[PDB]
Amino acid sequence: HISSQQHEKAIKSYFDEAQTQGVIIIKEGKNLSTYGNALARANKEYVPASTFKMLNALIGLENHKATTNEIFKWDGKKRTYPMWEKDMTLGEAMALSAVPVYQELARRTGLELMQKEVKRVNFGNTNIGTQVDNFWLVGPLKITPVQEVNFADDLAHNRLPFKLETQEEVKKMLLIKEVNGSKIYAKSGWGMGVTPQVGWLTGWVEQANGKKIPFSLNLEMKEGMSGSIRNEITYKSLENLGII
Numbered sequence: 001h002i003s004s005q006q007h008e009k010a011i012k013s014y015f016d017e018a019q020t021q022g023v024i025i026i027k028e029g030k031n032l033s034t035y036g037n038a039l040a041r042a043n044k045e046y047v048p049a050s051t052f053k054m055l056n057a058l059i060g061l062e063n064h065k066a067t068t069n070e071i072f073k074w075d076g077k078k079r080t081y082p083m084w085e086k087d088m089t090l091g092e093a094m095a096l097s098a099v100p101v102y103q104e105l106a107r108r109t110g111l112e113l114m115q116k117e118v119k120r121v122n123f124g125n126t127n128i129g130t131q132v133d134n135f136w137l138v139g140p141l142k143i144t145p146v147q148e149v150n151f152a153d154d155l156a157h158n159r160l161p162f163k164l165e166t167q168e169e170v171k172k173m174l175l176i177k178e179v180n181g182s183k184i185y186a187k188s189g190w191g192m193g194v195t196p197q198v199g200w201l202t203g204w205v206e207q208a209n210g211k212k213i214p215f216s217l218n219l220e221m222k223e224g225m226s227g228s229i230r231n232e233i234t235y236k237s238l239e240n241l242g243i244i
């Protein structure tokens with residue numbers, strides 16, 4: 001009973017309130033819907049930043065570079081945040097967006113196997129360059145918000161070219177919110193070492209009836225901008241649309 005015009009205007013205002021430019025792609029079945037205050041972003045390329053961890057984890061686990069219970073030990077060197085200065089599993093590192101662990105995993109996989117695997121799943125522009133430990137943070141790997149929802153959709157439905165158990169292992173690392181019967185599985189991302197900076201929140205809502213609705217929020221981040229606006233805007237948009 002709410003007009004399409006009202007939905008579009010409501011979601012535009014969430015991005016306007018946050019004083020940024022962004023888009024949120026929602027996918028229902030085969031149909032893509034683009035909301036926000038910068039709809040042209042939808043098919044533009046950005047570095048994936050931490051959202052690459054989802055694929056890093058799939059690759060590492062398929063190729064036996066790690067197990068889900070293995071503990072990556074803090075080497076005792078100072079890390080960007082105190083929370084990263086501890087021993088953690090892949091799942092814990094995913095929740096904390098703990099790059100040092102994912103760089104270690106990237107190094108275990110190695111450049112040649114990484115380039116091969118990123119080409120095989122056909123992720124973004126598929127170019128990882130020559131540095132195995134930062135291609136997802138500063139380039140050359142780039143991906144569009146549309147490609148990100150499609151990846152989220154593939155993962156949520158076990159359609160990626162990986163074992164079913166690999167995909168289940170990673171999906172289980174991604175639960176970030178329960179909203180009475182609805183479960184939100186997503187990975188956030190913030191590319192700080194690039195201009196302009198890019199923010200991501202990519203995932204899907206699993207509803208009580210078992211239906212899965214993939215999304216990808218993509219916006220421009222500034223200095224002094226808080227990381228949880230990505231979440232605030234996403235939840236507000238999913239709720240506005242009655243998805244949660």
Ligand SMILES: *C(=O)c1cc2cc(C(N)=O)ccn2c1N[C@@H](C(=O)O)[C@](C)(COC(N)=O)S(=O)O
Pocket residue numbers: 049050051080095096097099188189190191192227
């Ligand atoms: C993830 O994109 C991310 C990578 C890095 C890398 C560095 C570095 N010094 O090399 C610093 C910060 N990074 C990231 N962002 C996280 C962060 O805490 O800075 C991020 C804000 C994580 O917060 C959550 N939700 O875990 S982001 O959303 O990944």
